[PDB]
Amino acid sequence: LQEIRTSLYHPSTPPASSRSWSPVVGQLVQERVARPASLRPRWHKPSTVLKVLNPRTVVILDHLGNNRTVSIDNLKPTSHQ
DNA sequence: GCGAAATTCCATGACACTACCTTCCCAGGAAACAGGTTTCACCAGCCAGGCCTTGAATGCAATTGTCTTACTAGGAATATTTGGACTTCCCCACCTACCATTCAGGTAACTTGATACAAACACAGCCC
């Protein structure tokens, strides 16, 4: 049974598309506003990546003084650095 | 030909009707409250003696309950006559919804002010 468990199907990683982007420690990033009210900013003010944990999970330093460990499906690259 | 600069490219994401709802956090303070201690004074519990009120027994008087009759008025049916509630249609003024502006009130604070309560000695009213 221990050799049954180690022969299981592993999923496939999709090919990385052309307009991907990678976080850089020091790059300016903007989180998404949590529950965006009507006629309000979708995004907060810029923030600087403290630490990168994997290429999908990044610790940013929010305007509140917050070490809010967000995903990279949250963030956007800060335009025109 | 390299580099700098001017330009075209293309992958992508967000717009689609939106707020509540739940549970935990935070928070400051405060709300008293629930908890508890402390002490003094008072109100409640105790018991009995005297008297007054209630209960009962009663006799009787008129009050009340029943019976009977002549009758008055109530009700119903009528025609009609009359008095109106609501449906109808339309327009205007009034209430509202809104923002900006400002004023007033509530909280809050520091002070002030004034009255009520607590105490003491005496007075008056009513009762035994």
From Swiss-Prot:
<protein>
    <recommendedName>
        <fullName>Integrase</fullName>
    </recommendedName>
</protein>
